[PDB]
Amino acid sequence: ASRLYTLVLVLQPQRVLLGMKKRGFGAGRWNGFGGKVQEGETIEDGARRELQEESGLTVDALHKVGQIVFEFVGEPELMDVHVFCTDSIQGTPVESDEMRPCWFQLDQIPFKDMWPDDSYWFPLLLQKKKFHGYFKFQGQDTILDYTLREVDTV
């Protein structure tokens, strides 16, 4: 039993946009932009909507890059995260009460201040690879076990 989420990386040839989450799940970490998919909404439409809500950016073309399932031991619901990439956006990043977006050069990605799984799958994202992953966490800082494989079809 899993709940759908989206995650969007605005990845340009020389930088990536991340947002410092100020509240809720993952507050205090840099992350891509995303959230829960709504009833009657497609996953891609949810990804576009969340990118706007959290970053202020409008995306047209979204590319599927991965699917990652997160398990937190002691929590019944799995997070089924559909990851997307875009290099084509409109607008300028907006800081709000919920999120502080900032651009990072690719060699300065702040892995120590990101979810630990990102250290595994971001290198694949940066090399334009697609993937399926599963990360089992104990709390929010420890990966107990994981699987990650490259795929041709997300």
Ligand SMILES: CNc1nc2c(ncn2C)c(=O)[nH]1
């Ligand atoms: C659990 N791992 C994970 N969670 C995320 C991420 N970004 C937002 N949230 C809530 C991420 O990259 N990994």
